[PDB]
Ligand binder design. Structure first.
Ligand SMILES: [Br-]
Ligand SMILES: [Br-]
Ligand SMILES: [Br-]
Ligand SMILES: [Br-]
Ligand SMILES: [Br-]
Ligand SMILES: [Br-]
Ligand SMILES: [Br-]
Ligand SMILES: [Br-]
Lengths: 252, 252, 252, 252
């Protein structure tokens, strides 16, 4: 198969991509960093089993991989955006506007992009790596949330129509997924090093730990394998127990 | 209390506003047709208990109702849009934008301009008029539907930060809400006078009929009354027992 | 008309049974204590506007309220059961049949009793008083929490078939709803008193307070009044914003 | 590691035993007929790779598997009970008790029986094969719908507690699942051999095809492999798009 993975360096890209590559797929990797040739180069060096594309814009990115690698069989729209809290009256309209464009409009394009070619041949898989915040909203983060829920309903609606040309559609919304080196959204520090953050993570995720790239990677590879296409329309909540709820006074 | 019904001429506007003024409120009324000094006077003649505003903009409007009627106690962001039934690749990426700027960005643009003045009084109510399409998505309407899901989620998210100031925030997701003269989204023509359509209503709705303005106006006014701010963060499905799932061969 | 409220001395009992009477209905009231002619006489005493019953079984009560008061236009299955917090291997399978029996079996038995008459008169309103627990469970409450889920769903499944008959069915799932002296499930002792139970109830909710019987009643009477028929099949989370999710460390 | 798969001859039961074993899992099965020697033996003889047990009571089944095969690492509760459509009032309260008993008490009891070992050792996978009816309740299948519901929350609620003992808990809820020979609940005829039903599935599912036993089995195997435990608490709608919402008039 020929896959794509956007923002490979953040959120869930190195976990998706490599599990994808480990499975012998052709994985083209999009990252804004890959705008600088000094960058894309070392990446295509650090991971020779991957394919970092300089192509920035949605549709042209699809074009690079398709024309460079025959086509694109799976789309893993790993979308990211700085979740910078703010009571509603302190944000700005462009603040909300910029999250919808990077968490909502962005993946819609990629599909409006690759859509025709998967449909023509009757094959392809589409996966949005959204976010589990809607499943449980914190206070003061409305812009990023409404943005994530928007994408999730898109994947679900996108299935009632796409099951036609045999293209399963799903969305994996993460919460507390270890981003390691990446600041999007839970890096090693302090998330694993600090006692308050680790005690937080233990208290909020049922599993009492952070999530791994390998875990998400296994699911995308499984969804992207046709082994269970009948799962289409599903909104996967990869938050290891989250959101954990508050027990009454007394109950330890 | 002083209420604000947007697009009072369409969708849930006339239902809310007329019954909002019915329950005692000074209902300020926004509508794009009221940009013309002409129109703002046409509708006013039709309804003397309503107060039509010419202001189109979120901040100017709220600013106007503030300087016009003391404050803005209740906001009914009765949003509308005339999307399209298109296969993902048949929409322009521009089409999704507008859908988001409509069903999503506007309600937020309003909340962002009124939220400020409400938090001081530690009183107020926010009601979004959304859609019940996220509950049961239709193939080829991934825009309008998902945008609405964005508005719904933003409504629930905002409930998180606004309740700290005792401000309820809800969303009402209609479906088959008879709209009358308004082509948003179930005008009497032909949903009540055309055999094929009439039939589509009776077959997909539990009550088997379009809902009434009095019904949608009752809820809005019910929520806006203070009778149960404890529902805050709630999304109402005003789709009337809808959706109905087709049953096995033979079954009626 | 005539409406019935089960377990009226508990849960959302008082709020529903006094508000329905306020709205103008003849409210036959059921309750465990009404087994004793004294209790029924003492209740009917304190509240000559409510109609306490002796009947204990589903068809028994409804058939009795039919012969005495003409018919049963509204039914509020105020269900309860003293929940338990145990590791699932600590429970006894019987304990689940107890939860299931009272939380799902009682409501189904009643509707199975009344459906018929409402169906013939194409008029009637059914309300279920459940919980918001299936939305933000608590560990070790697997019995009650899940049992309620089937009740929440029992209500939803019905609204589809009873809608061709013009009969709405609603599910009210509250939580942290102060119940006076009723340990079902938030008595003033020790929730409106004990600082420990005060800080907590004041924490998992966006409104920071228990919900009031007044809010439960307003909603019960709003739905039964027959003003918003179109919300049929709706489940209401009367949790006042519950739950508030533990934000990361360092955040207020 | 050892696995159990109940009612193996029906529902998701076979795909379950078949895929699991192929993975290297010893799979101890359960099934009413296994109660008869000839029954169980032809099974042990037909499916040599499988390990059928004669034990049928939940309490009885566990100690026996834990005996012959040391322990129970994976619990797959494949709960059945034939659905009996009919208006709510024609239903006998015993027809809802019967549905729940077999769909809520049975799986609760199994975990009750097997938990502490999985908890004590701190490893194990719990998987409930419930249903997708609560996703799109057809008209008139109440009892069986709200039943699958409780079983679904049972799993979500349980995952919250067993997350400390590291035991993911899942609920795979299918519809249109091909049960080959089994009548539970989609057999060969007429689903794959009656233009009528092929046409029904052709409309209600997005993929206009039924769900294979292999896809279900494959989901069963992946969920208990340790590859994506972070999905703990997830309800999986395995219905290939069901339900497809009938769009407005004139649309193809
Ligand atoms: Br491949
Ligand atoms: Br918020
Ligand atoms: Br995350
Ligand atoms: Br929890
Ligand atoms: Br509508
Ligand atoms: Br409660
Ligand atoms: Br089977
Ligand atoms: Br099925």
């Amino acid at each position: 198969s020929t896959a794509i993975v956007t923002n490979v360096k953040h959120f869930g890209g190195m976990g998706s991509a490599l599990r994808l590559s480990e499975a012998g797929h052709t994985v083209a990797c999009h990252d804004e960093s890959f705008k600088q040739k000094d960058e894309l180069e070392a990446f295509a060096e650090t991971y020779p089993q991957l394919k970092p594309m300089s192509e920035q814009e949605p549709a042209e990115l699809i074009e690079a991989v398709t024309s460079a690698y025959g086509q694109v069989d799976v789309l893993v729209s790993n979308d990211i955006f700085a979740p910078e809290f703010q009571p509603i009256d302190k944000y700005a309209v462009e603040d909300y506007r910029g999250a919808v464009e990077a968490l909502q409009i962005r993946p819609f394009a990629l599909v409006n992009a690759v859509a025709s070619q998967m449909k023509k041949r009757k094959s392809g898989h589409i996966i949005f790596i959204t976010s589990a915040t809607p499943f449980g909203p914190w206070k003061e983060l409305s812009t990023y949330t409404s943005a994530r829920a928007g994408a999730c309903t898109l994947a679900n609606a996108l299935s009632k129509e796409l099951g036609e040309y045999n293209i399963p559609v799903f969305a994996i919304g993460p919460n507390y997924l270890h981003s390691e080196d990446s600041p999007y959204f839970y890096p090693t520090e302090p998330w694993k090093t600090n006692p308050e953050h680790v005690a937080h993570v233990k208290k909020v995720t049922a599993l009492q730990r952070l999530g791994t790239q390998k875990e998400l990677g296994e699911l995308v590879a499984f969804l992207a394998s046709g082994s269970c296409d009948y799962l289409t329309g599903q909104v996967f909540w990869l938050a290891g127990g989250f959101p954990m709820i508050e027990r009454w006074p007394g109950m330890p």
